């Protein structure tokens, strides 16, 4: 019994790596505010950038949270 | 005496004005430092 | 390139079978000087030539031994 | 860890000593820039 | 620069040297074969 | 094993780390002449443009260390390029060293501090317009700050010139085990020990700079 | 003593006399923490 | 001067005193510095040399570690 | 600090280099009474 | 006293040519290259060289003195060499 | 009749391009030393007390600087002005200026003047203009405008509230400034 | 609240207009001024500039260079020396002069006078991204 | 015996990874005041983008919520 | 026994996420220094974002403590 | 068996690591909007150093992810 | 005991909270830089902004060290 | 026996928080170098606060590793 | 047995070091689409100057792989 | 043998805290860039303090790793 709780400890430690993509999307959206404040007219665009860049910061998050589920569940 | 075999009590004695001034600065390098 | 051969075959060259007289007369000399111990009036500058020469020698020796064991760092087995 | 034993640091401290303080400045003072010539 | 040619005493040194030390490199390799490979075994 | 090349070394039983560590003096040479040779000329320029960087900010009391501190950075540096060659013991990796060069600038700095410029020497410990319910803690914060300073100096010094040291034997380590192995691979660790070579020379000038630096400014806050 | 108290002291007296006198001190004090080192070892 | 003298004699006849070995160090490192530094248009060759001997020091006091690390056994 | 200024130009050689430029691009039909109206007469002496 | 012009003549900054000449008469040109070379291979084949680590951080270092020398050669003799020369300028000017 | 035409344009420009300094209430140095006297006139006479205005106020501010211990430097537009004042202020002169009034002015024109006024090695502290302000068919009165320098906008407490701001924006900002001034001045001095 | 002074030294485009929005290609970035906007000052480089009116109605020019200033008051003066609407340039003759420009790059060689042509090139690649 | 000790353990290491949204609330307003400072009069849409911003960035932080109650709670 | 070990050890963990409430606290601020000095006419409002700002970012460091003092104290 | 468990132990813990490769990429879309808004002329090369960061900085996270895998499943 | 030795892991876990105290001070200085060189004559107002800003990224950071403290003391 | 292990490992994971002040001393020097490109007319008080806001960032690690100290060496 | 176990969790632990690495890059290549739509004629020297960044940063990274092979092998 | 166990782990938790300077070094090359393409006439002095920064936030990552080698062989 000591597979499952190294699956619970990994699964912590694989759920940690979720803070880079909170603060990547937050610089990422905070550099939309800024950029469209600065270039309003570009409004269309700076968000396709922003969406751009949230989907791949979400990305590496989602990476580390379905590393975690899988050693959680899937071993 | 050319330049080339001079030392710098040589030249303290043939231009008396580029001898350092060890009194108003006594130590290294007896100088400004924006004057090196 | 080339210039290292023409170099080697004057000098890097096995000895051909016609001075080899010539050798052991310089052989025999040097034990002379061995057989009376005249070797004192050798200044230390031809000794250490000579010295230098012996060195360059054994390292002919070492090489062959190189080369006789097929392996250059030590003894492979 | 070599540097955790204290039997050989005087050894590391001595030396040092004389270099900094004295030999280094000692050939410092003899480094001169004199003054511009008119 | 022209070249000087050895005094035919070091010549025959050094090739006598080269052929003497290809016989002990080969007679020290086969002598030591069979001991290193022995305590090779014996040492597992 | 991997630390051998700090060890303090011997060479027939004689510390041979005093004559290691007298020898950076000796590739200086100094000489009386108006015009001289290539070196002393180079070496004059790096000493004047070093004395240039590092003193013009000091008033003229602290520009009395001008001997001091030149010979500081002249000592380390070169001290730290001859451990880049090999097989070389660097003295800078030993924290008996970088301690004893350490302890004594910056308590002559907070000593000459605390007996002339008290009054300022205390004042310094809080900023000039710290609101007041936090004068307190900025106090504590202050003072061990500064009394933590020596051993930071020389805890960097010591820490870098080792890890980078250790960085290159494990790289080397590395580029001999795989010479056996695939030879691209070899090629580029080996390329990636000529960067990380490059990078050491950076680091040996930049750590002598940077310990000389702070000692000067611990000495400006205190003129 | 010639030479030396010459070509050593003599240059030197200006820094270790009234310049250096805080290192002076904190080489005390270092040397002080380095035989407590020593001493727990 | 040696390499020219040719008697054991000279070995104890030099002054093997304090002063003395320090003054034969001293005219070393001045043959050394006037003949490959102390010239005009100088060599870099004048310092590597130098270098050089020091990595020769260098491996001398650390050969005691790395036979440790010989390939093989004779 | 642009490019140009580090050659050494000012801003009013900068807006006749791009005045000049903006006017050549016109087409002719506006380019000659353009670059009549803002061509330069004054001599230096 | 004034300095002489040239140095003492190294070859790859190592060994100076009063060995080679030294050498010279009786092992000719030759000589002296394939004595280092014997020697080099007694060291490494003896186990007076030990092949480690060290080995290729030497080759490292080594390589980017060799490199260093060769780029910023001439340009630090260049440099040293036009320091003396504007020295000497002024001061004959001052003269 | 044309250039009353023209100088409305030309007036709304030339009073935008001033707004700043008078948002802003730029006051300049009372303490520096090098000033910079710029005089606007043409090179055609038979105009009646144009040049004589503008000579005398030149004149009367040259002494009223140098009486206070500024080096005053002189600039003239025109050949008429250049020609007043060069026998008496001759030793007080930077610039002039030929081939104006015949064809109307441009603002290649004040291009022109502003470039040969900045490539011209005298790092002036301050500046004034003087002008004939046009205010009908009958009358017109001799004007003067103030020229500030790099170091009097940056140095000022109220330009603090100009965000984006560093020594290249407003070097290039007074440099085209200069321009507008002087292009005003011709085109108030022409009607 | 934005009052907008738009001007050419010969044309006047704007005169206390209250606009709601204009684009400017400073040296320093584009941007975009509303009401209340910073204080700033800028000098142009080529590029358009977009008026926008309240109208929702947007006025494209072609500024070659010049000066913007945003005030406390919200009062902006836009000064160019070379104002013209893109229905007096042409794709084709920016297009050709942007390629003498750049083979008298290609060709120059001294510092001053390449600088010169790539202030050029600059302002005919900005005509040419501005056109089309 | 052990696995409740490690589910404790991995419910700590899984909250942990709430610092990425405080970290990236923290970028998205601090650009919000910058972006609102330049051009004060996008305030509505600047804000706007700023609340999608701090939902998106909260948003991660909450999946590692979530997987700690899942490892402390639902298992 | 096992389980006060964890208890301990997952407090510690989930304490440890207040990192990105300082960091978060830290830009918030900054960028108000920073949007006071460009537009100082602004000031009162900047300081309300950044009070928002502030109180938003550390409301995540305070749910870390909360998982924390129920790890240790409650659960 | 305890062998396997710090192997899942320690691939979550290499796991942890892809945060910095998210911050990174966050960081990199960023600024590719604050420069796309100053700059809207340079949209192509700037989203190619764009492309080239998300490029370099995630390769960093992919690394962990592989040393992640090499201990859960190979060595 | 294992109670001491959780105790001792868990102190040392807490610790880390102290990392985004000092990026936040980091943070928050640096902006004070750059807003001094952007408006010089708001010296004194900024800089208190900076210490308060300070005053608050160090609590946060105070507060997991005194947590360490009450797992290693306290209980 | 087993509580020197954990002292090992309070003291690694107390350690860990000198990141922060790693990061927040790039971000002090780097906002310098802004900074002082932006006005290098204040080249001294802009370094003033430079070494002011590091001589308190890295004060924040110095904690930690005290911490560290505090749990390898005196318990 | 417990000994491998613990390299397998070091080795992980210390190659979460190379999340700073990521971070850095994006940083690097950020401020380089930054200044380059800044100044697009310095083209070359910025992206000198972002590699020598990249290398430094990578630099930092190996730091914390030699530690990771100084556990998982030479013990 | 359980002191090797946690000396190990302890060696790598010692060595996750050099993510902060790798990024600190980032944000240090960045700003070198930013600050460079802002002001190309001051590269000397600009590069002086990113220099400066890098020695100064590397070197925080370097006691974390020399915890680690006091963890590892020192004891
Ligand atoms: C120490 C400095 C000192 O006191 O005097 C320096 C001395 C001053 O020279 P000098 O005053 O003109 O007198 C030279 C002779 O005394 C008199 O000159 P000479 O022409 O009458 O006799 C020449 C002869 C006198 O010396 C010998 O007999 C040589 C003995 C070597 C053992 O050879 C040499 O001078 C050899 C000098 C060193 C050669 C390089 C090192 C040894 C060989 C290297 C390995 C072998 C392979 C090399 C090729 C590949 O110069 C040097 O020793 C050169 C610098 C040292 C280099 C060492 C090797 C670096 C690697
Ligand atoms: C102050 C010092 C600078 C001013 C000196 C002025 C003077 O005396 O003459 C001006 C002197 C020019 O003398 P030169 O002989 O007319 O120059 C010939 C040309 O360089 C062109 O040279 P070349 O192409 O005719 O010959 C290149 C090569 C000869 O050809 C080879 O490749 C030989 C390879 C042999 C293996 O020579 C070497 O590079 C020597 C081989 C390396 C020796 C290593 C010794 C063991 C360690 O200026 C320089 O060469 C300055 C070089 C500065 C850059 C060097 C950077 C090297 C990298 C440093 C890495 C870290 C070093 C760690 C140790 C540091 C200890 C302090
Ligand atoms: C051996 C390590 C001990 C070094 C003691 C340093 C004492 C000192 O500074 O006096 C210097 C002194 C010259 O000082 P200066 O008046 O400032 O030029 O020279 C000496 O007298 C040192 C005497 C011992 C020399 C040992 C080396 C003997 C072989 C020579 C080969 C090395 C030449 C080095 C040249 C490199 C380029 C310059």
């Known amino acids: 019994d000591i597979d499952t709780a190294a699956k619970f400890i990994g699964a912590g430690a694989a759920t940690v790596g979720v803070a880079g993509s909170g603060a990547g999307i937050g610089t990422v959206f905070g550099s939309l505010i800024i950029g469209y404040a600065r270039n309003p007219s570009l409004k269309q665009q700076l968000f396709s950038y922003a969406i751009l860049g949230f989907a791949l910061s979400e990305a590496m998050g989602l990476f580390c949270l379905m590393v975690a589920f899988l050693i959680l569940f899937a071993m | 005496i050319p330049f080339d075999q001079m030392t710098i009590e040589d030249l303290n004695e043939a231009f008396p004005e580029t001898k350092l001034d060890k009194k108003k600065y006594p130590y290294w390098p007896h100088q400004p430092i924006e004057n090196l | 390139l080339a210039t290292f051969w023409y170099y080697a075959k004057v000098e890097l060259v096995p000895p051909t079978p016609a001075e080899i007289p010539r050798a052991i007369q310089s052989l025999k000399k040097i034990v002379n000087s061995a057989q009376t111990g005249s070797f004192k009036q050798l200044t230390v500058k031809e000794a250490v030539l000579n010295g230098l020469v012996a060195t360059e020698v054994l390292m002919w020796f070492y090489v062959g031994e190189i080369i006789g064991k097929r392996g250059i760092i030590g003894y492979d087995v | 860890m070599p540097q955790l034993n204290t039997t050989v640091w005087p050894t590391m401290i001595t030396p040092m000593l004389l270099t900094l303080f004295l030999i280094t400045q000692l050939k410092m003072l003899n480094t001169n820039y004199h003054l511009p010539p008119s | 620069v022209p070249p000087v040619q050895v005094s035919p005493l070091i010549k025959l040194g050094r090739y006598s040297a080269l052929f003497l030390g290809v016989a002990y490199g080969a007679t020290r390799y086969n002598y030591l074969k069979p001991r290193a490979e022995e305590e090779r075994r014996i040492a597992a | 094993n991997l630390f051998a090349s700090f060890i303090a070394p011997t060479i027939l039983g004689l510390p041979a780390?005093?004559?290691?560590?007298?020898?950076?003096?000796?590739?200086?040479?100094?000489?009386?002449?108006?015009?001289?040779?290539?070196?002393?000329?180079?070496?004059?320029?790096?000493?004047?443009?070093?004395?240039?960087?590092?003193?013009?900010?000091?008033?003229?009391?602290?520009?009395?260390?001008?001997?001091?501190?030149?010979?500081?950075?002249?000592?380390?540096?070169?001290?730290?390029?001859?451990?880049?060659?090999?097989?070389?013991?660097?003295?800078?990796?030993?924290?008996?060293?970088?301690?004893?060069?350490?302890?004594?600038?910056?308590?002559?700095?907070?000593?000459?501090?605390?007996?002339?410029?008290?009054?300022?020497?205390?004042?310094?410990?809080?900023?000039?317009?710290?609101?007041?319910?936090?004068?307190?803690?900025?106090?504590?914060?202050?003072?061990?700050?500064?009394?933590?300073?020596?051993?930071?100096?020389?805890?960097?010094?010591?820490?870098?010139?080792?890890?980078?040291?250790?960085?290159?034997?494990?790289?080397?380590?590395?580029?001999?085990?795989?010479?056996?192995?695939?030879?691209?691979?070899?090629?580029?660790?080996?390329?990636?020990?000529?960067?990380?070579?490059?990078?050491?020379?950076?680091?040996?000038?930049?750590?002598?700079?940077?310990?000389?630096?702070?000692?000067?400014?611990?000495?400006?806050?205190?003129? | 003593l010639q030479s030396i108290i010459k070509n050593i002291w003599i240059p030197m007296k200006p820094y270790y006399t009234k310049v250096y006198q805080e290192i002076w001190i904190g080489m005390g004090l270092m040397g002080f923490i380095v035989y407590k080192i020593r001493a727990a070892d | 001067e040696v390499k020219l003298g040719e008697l054991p004699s000279w070995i104890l006849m030099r002054d093997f005193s304090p002063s003395g070995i320090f003054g034969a160090f001293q005219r070393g490192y001045y043959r050394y510095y006037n003949k490959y530094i102390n010239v005009k248009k100088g060599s870099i060759s004048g310092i590597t040399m130098v270098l050089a001997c020091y990595v020769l020091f260098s491996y001398s006091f650390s050969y005691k570690h790395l036979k440790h690390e010989r390939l093989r056994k004779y | 600090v642009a490019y140009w200024r580090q050659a050494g130009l000012s801003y009013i050689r900068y807006s006749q280099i791009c005045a000049k430029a903006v006017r050549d691009a016109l087409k002719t039909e506006f380019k000659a009474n353009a670059e009549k109206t803002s061509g330069s007469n004054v001599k230096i002496v | 006293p004034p300095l002489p012009e040239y140095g003492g003549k190294v070859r790859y900054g190592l060994i100076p040519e009063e060995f080679f000449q030294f050498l010279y008469p009786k092992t000719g040109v030759t000589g002296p290259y394939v004595l280092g070379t014997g020697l080099i291979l007694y060291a490494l084949s003896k186990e007076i060289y030990v092949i480690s680590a060290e080995t290729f951080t030497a080759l490292s270092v080594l390589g980017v003195m060799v490199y260093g020398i060769k780029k910023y050669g001439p340009f630090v003799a260049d440099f040293a060499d036009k320091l003396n020369e504007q020295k000497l300028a002024q001061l004959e000017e001052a003269k | 009749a044309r250039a009353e035409r023209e100088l409305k344009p030309a007036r709304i420009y030339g009073l935008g391009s001033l707004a700043l300094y008078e948002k802003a209430d730029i006051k300049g140095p009372e303490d520096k030393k090098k000033h910079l006297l710029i005089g606007v006139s043409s090179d055609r006479g038979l105009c009646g007390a144009i040049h004589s205005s503008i000579a005398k106020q030149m004149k009367s501010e040259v002494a009223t600087l140098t009486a206070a211990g500024?080096?005053?430097?002189?600039?003239?537009?025109?050949?008429?002005?250049?020609?007043?004042?060069?026998?008496?202020?001759?030793?007080?002169?930077?610039?002039?200026?030929?081939?104006?009034?015949?064809?109307?002015?441009?603002?290649?024109?004040?291009?022109?003047?502003?470039?040969?006024?900045?490539?011209?090695?005298?790092?002036?502290?301050?500046?004034?203009?003087?002008?004939?302000?046009?205010?009908?068919?009958?009358?017109?009165?001799?004007?003067?405008?103030?020229?500030?320098?790099?170091?009097?906008?940056?140095?000022?407490?109220?330009?603090?509230?100009?965000?984006?701001?560093?020594?290249?924006?407003?070097?290039?900002?007074?440099?085209?400034?200069?321009?507008?001034?002087?292009?005003?001045?011709?085109?108030?001095?022409?009607? | 609240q934005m009052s907008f002074t738009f001007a050419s030294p010969t044309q006047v485009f704007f005169n206390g207009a209250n606009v709601r929005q204009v684009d400017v290609p400073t040296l320093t970035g584009a941007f975009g001024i509303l009401a209340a906007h910073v204080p700033t000052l800028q000098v142009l480089r080529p590029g358009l500039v977009v008026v926008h009116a309240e109208d929702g109605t947007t006025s494209k020019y072609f500024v070659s260079s010049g000066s913007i200033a945003v005030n406390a008051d919200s009062s902006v003066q836009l000064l160019a020396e070379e104002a013209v609407t893109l229905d007096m340039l042409d794709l084709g003759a920016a297009k050709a002069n942007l390629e003498k420009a750049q083979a008298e790059l290609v060709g120059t060689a001294d510092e001053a006078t390449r600088a010169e042509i790539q202030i050029r090139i600059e302002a005919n690649e900005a005509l040419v991204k501005a056109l089309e």
Request: proline share 5%; charged share 15%.
């Open chain 6, 17 to 223: 780390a005093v004559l290691i560590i007298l020898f950076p003096p000796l590739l200086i040479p100094t000489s009386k002449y108006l015009i001289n040779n290539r070196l002393i000329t180079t070496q004059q320029w790096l000493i004047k443009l070093t004395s240039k960087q590092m003193m013009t900010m000091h008033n003229t009391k602290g520009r009395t260390w001008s001997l001091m501190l030149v010979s500081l950075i002249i000592f380390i540096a070169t001290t730290n390029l001859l451990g880049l060659l090999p097989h070389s013991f660097t003295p800078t990796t030993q924290l008996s060293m970088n301690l004893a060069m350490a302890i004594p600038l910056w308590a002559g700095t907070v000593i000459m501090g605390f007996r002339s410029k008290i009054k300022n020497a205390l004042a310094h410990f809080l900023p000039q317009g710290t609101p007041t319910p936090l004068i307190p803690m900025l106090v504590i914060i202050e003072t061990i700050s500064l009394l933590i300073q020596p051993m930071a100096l020389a805890v960097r010094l010591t820490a870098n010139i080792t890890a980078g040291h250790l960085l290159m034997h494990l790289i080397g380590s590395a580029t001999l085990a795989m010479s056996t192995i695939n030879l691209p691979s070899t090629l580029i660790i080996f390329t990636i020990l000529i960067l990380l070579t490059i990078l050491e020379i950076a680091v040996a000038l930049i750590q002598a700079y940077v310990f000389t630096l702070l000692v000067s400014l611990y000495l400006h806050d205190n003129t």
């Open chain 11, 70 to 191: 500024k080096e005053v430097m002189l600039v003239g537009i025109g050949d008429k002005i250049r020609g007043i004042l060069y026998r008496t202020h001759s030793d007080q002169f930077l610039v002039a200026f030929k081939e104006v009034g015949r064809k109307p002015p441009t603002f290649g024109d004040a291009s022109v003047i502003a470039l040969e006024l900045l490539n011209s090695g005298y790092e002036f502290d301050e500046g004034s203009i003087i002008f004939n302000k046009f205010r009908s068919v009958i009358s017109y009165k001799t004007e003067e405008k103030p020229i500030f320098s790099l170091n009097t906008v940056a140095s000022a407490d109220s330009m603090s509230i100009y965000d984006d701001i560093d020594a290249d924006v407003l070097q290039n900002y007074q440099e085209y400034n200069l321009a507008n001034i002087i292009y005003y001045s011709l085109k108030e001095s022409t009607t």
